[PDB]
């Protein structure tokens, strides 16, 4: 059901 693409920070630079 849950996939990482839908996380708020999925495409945020961790730096």
């Amino acid at each position: 059901h849950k996939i990482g693409s839908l996380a708020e920070n999925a495409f945020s630079d961790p730096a």
Partner: antibody, heavy 114, light 113 residues
Framework: EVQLVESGGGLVQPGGSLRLSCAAS????????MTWVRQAPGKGLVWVGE????????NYAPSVKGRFTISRDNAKNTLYLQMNSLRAEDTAVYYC???????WGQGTLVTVSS | DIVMTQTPLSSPVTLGQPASISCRSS???????????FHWLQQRPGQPPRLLIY???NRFSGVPDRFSGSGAGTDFTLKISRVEAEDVGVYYC?????????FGQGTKLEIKR
């Protein structure tokens, strides 16, 4: 500087087991999903799976389901890939990545050979 | 699983000229009623891949303006406008709309000199 330092690779016999580690610094690891991707020598990228921050969701590629286990230890900022029943077709460089590919480890080569 | 199809080699592109790389997906990459999780990655030899464009057209950190993305549904294109020598490498398309996430086979950019 974000760092993702991998370890545990090397030679393993077919049918055997190996555990890879990916240690993170420079960001709040406990807030990110983490991802494994692999690349056989001379071939393309293949997704292995992902794990959410609290480990309540773990998604796997069909090619590894039931043989590989992804886990993490947020207290040690470390992601793990436990591989069992390894076959030659599993030979590859294994990469970890944050989120959906937003920062990458250097890769560690696993060679499955007798 | 969703199949991503791209060609293995680009036409030789001259320095300072544009290159285009296309990818087709076997089904729509629109997630339910929201975003299109289609991305482009760049890989140089001996190096890990790097995210270049995410969600069709968004440049990732440190990605300069000569890289742009377009497309919709099942057809997408990366344009590299004014190719530089450092842009040599392999460019992968990717979908993360559904698990397992999948990648194209990789298109190698060849520079004509």
């Amino acid at each position: 500087e974000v760092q993702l330092v991998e370890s545990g690779g090397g030679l393993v016999q077919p049918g055997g087991s190996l555990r890879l580690s990916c240690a993170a610094s420079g960001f709040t690891f406990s807030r990110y999903w983490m991802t494994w991707v692999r690349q056989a020598p001379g071939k393309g990228l293949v997704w292995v799976g992902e794990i959410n921050p609290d480990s309540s969701t773990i998604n796997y590629a069909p090619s590894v389901k039931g043989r590989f286990t992804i886990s993490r230890d947020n207290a040690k900022n470390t992601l793990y890939l436990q591989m069992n029943s390894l076959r030659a077709e599993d030979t590859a460089v294994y990469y970890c990545a944050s989120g959906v590919f937003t920062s990458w480890g250097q890769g560690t080569l696993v060679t499955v050979s007798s | 699983d969703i199949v991503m199809t791209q060609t293995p080699l680009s036409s030789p592109v001259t320095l300072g000229q544009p290159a285009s790389i296309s990818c087709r997906s076997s089904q729509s990459l629109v997630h339910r009623q929201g975003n299109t999780y289609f991305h482009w990655l760049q890989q140089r030899p001996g190096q890990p891949p790097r995210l270049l464009i995410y969600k069709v057209s968004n440049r990732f950190s440190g990605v300069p303006d000569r890289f742009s993305g377009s497309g919709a549904g099942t057809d997408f294109t990366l344009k590299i406008s004014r190719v530089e020598a450092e842009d040599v490498g392999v460019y992968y398309c990717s979908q993360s709309t559904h698990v397992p996430y999948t990648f194209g086979q990789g298109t190698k950019l060849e520079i004509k000199r």
